[PDB]
Design a protein around this nucleic acid. Structure first.
Length: 91
DNA sequence: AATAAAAGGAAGTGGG
DNA sequence: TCCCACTTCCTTTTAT
């Protein structure tokens, strides 16, 4: 299937769910979730993966944190803010 | 305070 | 079989 970072990047590069997620600095890959609207986006991720349960922002961030080990997505020390690697922003 | 976020271990799921 | 890439579940810590 489709990887979570890819799903997120595709929404950012096509501008859907701007009420739920947006660039903080596009050229640096840094993006941010909305406090109020992030659950619509979590829900959409879970629908698209066919998961048994309703996907939530907390479970999605749990996955997001695993990218910290590999490097695709780094947590920034700002509320609800993350950062794609340069490698991810190419392909 | 209070509370939303961040954290992360551990066993579970799909599908290749 | 095994491994990947999450997903689920829960308590504890940290940041606002």
């Amino acid at each position: 299937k489709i990887r979570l970072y890819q799903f997120l990047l595709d929404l950012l590069r096509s501008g859907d769910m701007k009420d739920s997620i947006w660039w903080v600095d596009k050229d640096k890959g840094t993006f941010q979730f909305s406090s109020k609207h992030k659950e619509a986006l979590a829900h959409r991720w879970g629908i698209q993966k066919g998961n048994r349960k309703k996907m939530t922002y907390q479970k999605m961030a749990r996955a997001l944190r695993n990218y910290g080990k590999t490097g695709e997505v780094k947590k920034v020390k700002k509320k609800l803010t993350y950062q794609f690697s340069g490698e991810v922003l190419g392909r």
